Design an enzyme around this catalytic site. Structure first.
Site, PDB file in Angstrom:
ATOM      1  N   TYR A   1      38.194  39.361  31.709  1.00  0.00           N
ATOM      2  CA  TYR A   1      38.771  40.542  31.089  1.00  0.00           C
ATOM      3  C   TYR A   1      37.662  41.330  30.427  1.00  0.00           C
ATOM      4  CZ  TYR A   1      41.444  43.706  28.169  1.00  0.00           C
ATOM      5  OH  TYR A   1      41.959  44.840  27.580  1.00  0.00           O
TER       6      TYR A   1
ATOM      7  N   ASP B   1      29.490  40.089  28.412  1.00  0.00           N
ATOM      8  CA  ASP B   1      30.517  40.659  27.563  1.00  0.00           C
ATOM      9  C   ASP B   1      30.901  39.624  26.507  1.00  0.00           C
ATOM     10  OD1 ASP B   1      32.778  41.661  26.376  1.00  0.00           O
ATOM     11  OD2 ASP B   1      33.698  42.342  28.249  1.00  0.00           O
TER      12      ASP B   1
ATOM     13  N   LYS C   1      34.969  42.759  18.874  1.00  0.00           N
ATOM     14  CA  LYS C   1      36.200  42.437  18.141  1.00  0.00           C
ATOM     15  C   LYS C   1      36.012  42.026  16.690  1.00  0.00           C
ATOM     16  CE  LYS C   1      39.715  41.293  21.544  1.00  0.00           C
ATOM     17  NZ  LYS C   1      39.090  41.363  22.883  1.00  0.00           N
TER      18      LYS C   1
ATOM     19  N   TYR D   1      50.384  47.042  25.954  1.00  0.00           N
ATOM     20  CA  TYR D   1      51.050  46.602  27.179  1.00  0.00           C
ATOM     21  C   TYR D   1      52.572  46.543  27.029  1.00  0.00           C
ATOM     22  CZ  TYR D   1      46.614  45.851  29.473  1.00  0.00           C
ATOM     23  OH  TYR D   1      45.403  46.041  30.097  1.00  0.00           O
TER      24      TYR D   1
HETATM   25  O1  LIG Z   1      47.554  42.830  19.488  1.00  0.00           O
HETATM   26  C1  LIG Z   1      46.889  43.226  20.453  1.00  0.00           C
HETATM   27  C2  LIG Z   1      45.849  44.125  20.321  1.00  0.00           C
HETATM   28  C3  LIG Z   1      45.385  44.321  21.762  1.00  0.00           C
HETATM   29  C4  LIG Z   1      46.190  43.465  22.522  1.00  0.00           C
HETATM   30  C5  LIG Z   1      46.175  43.237  23.842  1.00  0.00           C
HETATM   31  C6  LIG Z   1      47.056  42.336  24.453  1.00  0.00           C
HETATM   32  N1  LIG Z   1      47.029  42.117  25.793  1.00  0.00           N
HETATM   33  C7  LIG Z   1      45.886  42.617  26.611  1.00  0.00           C
HETATM   34  C8  LIG Z   1      45.424  41.641  27.689  1.00  0.00           C
HETATM   35  N2  LIG Z   1      46.562  40.931  28.324  1.00  0.00           N
HETATM   36  C9  LIG Z   1      46.649  40.754  29.660  1.00  0.00           C
HETATM   37  O2  LIG Z   1      47.592  40.140  30.159  1.00  0.00           O
HETATM   38  C10 LIG Z   1      45.704  41.296  30.535  1.00  0.00           C
HETATM   39  C11 LIG Z   1      45.708  42.672  30.781  1.00  0.00           C
HETATM   40  C12 LIG Z   1      44.788  43.237  31.661  1.00  0.00           C
HETATM   41  C13 LIG Z   1      43.864  42.423  32.318  1.00  0.00           C
HETATM   42  C14 LIG Z   1      43.867  41.047  32.087  1.00  0.00           C
HETATM   43 CL1  LIG Z   1      42.715  40.052  32.905  1.00  0.00          CL
HETATM   44  C15 LIG Z   1      44.783  40.479  31.198  1.00  0.00           C
HETATM   45  C16 LIG Z   1      47.614  40.351  27.439  1.00  0.00           C
HETATM   46  C17 LIG Z   1      48.151  41.426  26.493  1.00  0.00           C
HETATM   47  C18 LIG Z   1      47.974  41.685  23.626  1.00  0.00           C
HETATM   48  C19 LIG Z   1      47.949  41.957  22.256  1.00  0.00           C
HETATM   49  C20 LIG Z   1      47.075  42.831  21.723  1.00  0.00           C
HETATM   50  C1  LIG Z   2      39.104  42.938  23.899  1.00  0.00           C
HETATM   51  C2  LIG Z   2      37.999  42.787  24.892  1.00  0.00           C
HETATM   52  C3  LIG Z   2      37.441  44.007  25.504  1.00  0.00           C
HETATM   53  C4  LIG Z   2      37.985  45.380  25.166  1.00  0.00           C
HETATM   54  O1  LIG Z   2      37.936  45.676  23.770  1.00  0.00           O
HETATM   55  P1  LIG Z   2      38.873  46.846  23.166  1.00  0.00           P
HETATM   56  O2  LIG Z   2      38.312  47.026  21.781  1.00  0.00           O
HETATM   57  O3  LIG Z   2      40.265  46.271  23.238  1.00  0.00           O
HETATM   58  O4  LIG Z   2      38.689  48.060  24.053  1.00  0.00           O
HETATM   59  C5  LIG Z   2      36.422  43.856  26.435  1.00  0.00           C
HETATM   60  N1  LIG Z   2      35.920  42.653  26.771  1.00  0.00           N
HETATM   61  C6  LIG Z   2      36.353  41.470  26.275  1.00  0.00           C
HETATM   62  C7  LIG Z   2      35.737  40.165  26.711  1.00  0.00           C
HETATM   63  C8  LIG Z   2      37.440  41.469  25.281  1.00  0.00           C
HETATM   64  O5  LIG Z   2      37.897  40.292  24.775  1.00  0.00           O
END
Ligand SMILES: O=C1C=Cc2cc(N3CCN(C(=O)c4cccc(Cl)c4)CC3)ccc21
Ligand SMILES: *Cc1c(COP(=O)(O)O)cnc(C)c1O
Ligand SMILES: O=C1C=Cc2cc(N3CCN(C(=O)c4cccc(Cl)c4)CC3)ccc21
Ligand SMILES: *Cc1c(COP(=O)(O)O)cnc(C)c1O
Ligand SMILES: [Cl-]
Lengths: 428, 429
Positions: free
Chosen positions: A150, A247, A276, A18
């Protein structure tokens, strides 16, 4: 490469989660090692040891470089790195499938391996859609969820993410239009479940599945809800003939204080996703489990098969490490461990409740959250926590941790102290 | 577990690619080891070594258990298995990103790591859609491709797969509706490109991108097309302001005789996907590359960021073995190696041309295909190849191989002989 060289290459060429290219407010910090609960990071040209309070995004449940997991990888590497899963099978896949079927909520009898959580969610949706098509009801093709969720970043997964958190406003005309119930509350309210049923009732003929994160919603806001809502979801889904999908990609493998979060309610979904912490945070791997009934109905359908097959499906290396990680968890008193961790988080975060900028403090298993009254500035929070020997990554208004299960009581209090100090600075 | 126990667990509990539970025509074969170009498989209770003619689905370019690649993994394991890529960076990511920007077609300056080819395709589409939204053109949100393609199994990736191969009729009202041009021909015909252009022109205002596999179409039918078609696509996309995306998830890293299939045409896409052979077949990893223009336009857009971030993004272990695999390829005369393999495949498969059931024999780099006039019986073909010491996986009317680059002339002879024999058995009904 030197840390300075790594930074230069990174700024020019590397996307982060992001992130932008060329418009980052802060450079990323160079990580040079990880061992146990500790990361070695470069700060002002010097290596510093800090606690991985985030478990490297929920992954590192046993810490980094655990001898049992390291050895599982190198043992498998000696025999077979990978073979295609089309027409072949192997011991790591069989061992892991056997384990997962045994330990997941009752009735989840088949296992589809993929390479990431988002893919596992798309597989779950595909299972649900092929299921109904196998029943001659192709109209059942939409998904229902509650807000605050999410489910990943691929396009179908996006469609069931929280519309606000998932920035659906930027995706007008692109995403599948799904059914959203209001945010599930923390405390149990029968009126919420009644309203959920009433809404589902209006869409039952077009719904393939309800998809939710059980008990804990992660990336959509670190919110917890009463497990009794899962009972209600199971009942509603049974009566209206809509599949239930959990999930558990964030909640799986002990994180919420039960082996799977569904266990807090004794509920079995029709389909379940995990990911995860599946490999103990070594390697990308996910799984989608479904019931025998779902599997047979798909298999008897028009395609005669589930129409999905990732290149690295059931990768022997990832499966071998996962077997070791799951066995390591099951071979110890994990429930007492998580209970102790939760108690440490509760005790350590209590003082935050009195801080001027703190709205809520909440703990569920090995998850601790300080909810603040304003968005947390990472440019201040990150170095503040590093100054206290802790790697913390707030998001939005939340200062939170999900520490490795191997953290000592002293390490947990070091984490919570850093969290409190970050929260104090937020109000400054 | 014993092989018998593995079969019992597998039959009850394990999905396979595009498979059933409980309705499989033949049980899968238990694999117990893999070394170099050889798999050890269980046949009637006994371990037998057979050639991995498929490179384990394009992945095993240097063969299994290559000492350099084993070593790279073991070395990284002792330092750092993984850290989150949110707010942190590391040497394996930086090393790999630098390598990839250097060796890919000119202009691809930024690298987004993900964990599979399908995800990398969805990232590519997301880049394209966010690009146009950052240009104030949200109407440009559809994709165009030619038929015969394959781009993965996630729902957006499905929408640009061949409608037949991808079983689109079973997905009525589910998939995004995309723009399909006719099947790209083998031989270069300017009329095809002119027709493609006219079709694109009509849709230009609603198209974010053209997405194609360059030179070789894999899972959609193992078809080859003249590289000049890609030159035309670059030109059309330039003139009509549509992004060009090359999916090199199967073609990358030398497989078609060039380092990337795009190099056969001397053109650069705006966005590129790589995956299957990236880690030399050790671990799941993929990458999506894009130009500085695409990256800056997204970053200046409404979200101020690309809205994607996988959990295991830029995994140190996968990145480390990938660096080793890419350096191993670049540190040898790979071009001569692939040319020799292509020659071996051509020489070994030439006899199949005369066979009654064979309609075509075609070779492109380290890829060899025998196309038949009828479906190949898998219950007959699989044991037929195994009896000859070769693991082959036919589908539809195609008997094909994409062998490891380390295969000797004798091994290529063995692989091609088995292929010719499978094709001979097809003709006998
Ligand atoms: O270190 C990391 C590895 C993956 C990752 C993701 C991540 N995100 C993904 C989800 N996110 C959102 O704000 C988000 C985005 C979309 C929908 C929804 Cl519901 C919340 C915060 C930033 C931060 C850090 C890391
Ligand atoms: C992180 C996450 C996903 C997506 O997993 P990725 O390995 O980042 O594609 C889906 N559902 C939930 C509830 C999660 O926390
Ligand atoms: O070992 C394997 C690892 C992955 C894999 C896939 C796979 N497939 C997927 C693609 N495929 C298709 O028919 C297909 C499907 C959809 C669209 C399109 Cl265009 C063609 C054949 C079977 C076979 C074997 C393996
Ligand atoms: C296999 C393939 C994909 C999908 O990769 P996975 O790793 O199976 O998700 C995408 N595009 C092409 C051209 C492929 O050959
Ligand atoms: Cl050492």
């Amino acid at each position: 490469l030197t840390p300075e060289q790594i930074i230069a290459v990174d700024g020019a060429h590397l996307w982060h989660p992001y992130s932008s290219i060329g418009r980052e407010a802060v450079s990323p910090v160079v990580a040079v090692a990880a061992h146990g609960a500790w990361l070695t990071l470069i700060r002002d040209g010097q290596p510093i040891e800090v606690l991985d309070a985030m478990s490297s995004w929920w992954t590192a449940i046993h810490g980094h470089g655990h001898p049992a997991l390291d050895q599982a990888l190198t043992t498998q590497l000696r025999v077979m790195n990978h073979v295609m899963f089309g027409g072949l099978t192997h011991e790591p896949a069989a061992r892991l499938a056997k384990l997962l079927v045994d330990i997941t909520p009752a009735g989840l009898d088949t296992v589809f391996f993929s390479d990431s959580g988002s893919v596992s969610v798309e597989v779950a949706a595909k299972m649900a859609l092929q299921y109904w098509r196998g029943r001659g009801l192709p109209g059942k093709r939409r998904l229902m969820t509650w807000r605050g969720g999410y489910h990943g970043d691929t396009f179908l997964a996006m469609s069931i993410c929280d519309p606000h958190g998932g920035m659906h406003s930027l995706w007008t005309d692109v995403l599948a239009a799904q059914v959203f119930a209001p945010q599930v509350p923390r405390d149990y309210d029968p009126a919420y479940s009644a309203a959920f049923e009433a809404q589902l009732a209006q869409h039952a003929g077009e719904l393939a599945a309800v998809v939710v994160e059980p008990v804990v919603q992660g990336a959509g806001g670190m919110r917890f809800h009463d497990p009794r809502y899962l009972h209600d979801l199971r009942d509603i889904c049974r009566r209206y003939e809509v599949l239930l999908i959990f999930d558990e990609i964030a909640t799986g493998f002990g994180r919420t204080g039960a082996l799977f979060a569904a266990d807090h309610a004794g509920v079995s979904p029709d389909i379940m996703c995990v990911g995860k912490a599946l490999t103990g945070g070594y390697l990308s791997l996910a799984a989608t489990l479904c019931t025998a009934d779902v599997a047979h109905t798909i298999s008897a359908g028009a395609a005669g098969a589930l129409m999905h097959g990732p290149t690295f499906m059931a990768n022997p290396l990832a499966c071998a490490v996962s077997v070791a990680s799951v066995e390591l968890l099951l071979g110890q008193d994990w429930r007492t461990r998580i209970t102790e961790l939760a108690a440490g988080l509760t005790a350590g975060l209590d003082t935050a409740r009195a801080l001027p900028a703190v709205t809520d403090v909440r703990v569920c298993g090995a998850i601790g959250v300080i909810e603040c009254d304003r968005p947390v500035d990472l440019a201040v929070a990150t170095p503040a926590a590093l100054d206290r020997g802790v790697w913390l990554r707030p998001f939005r208004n939340l200062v939170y941790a999900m520490p490795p299960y191997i953290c000592t009581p002293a390490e947990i209090t070091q984490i919570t102290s850093a969290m409190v100090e970050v929260a104090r600075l937020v109000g400054s």
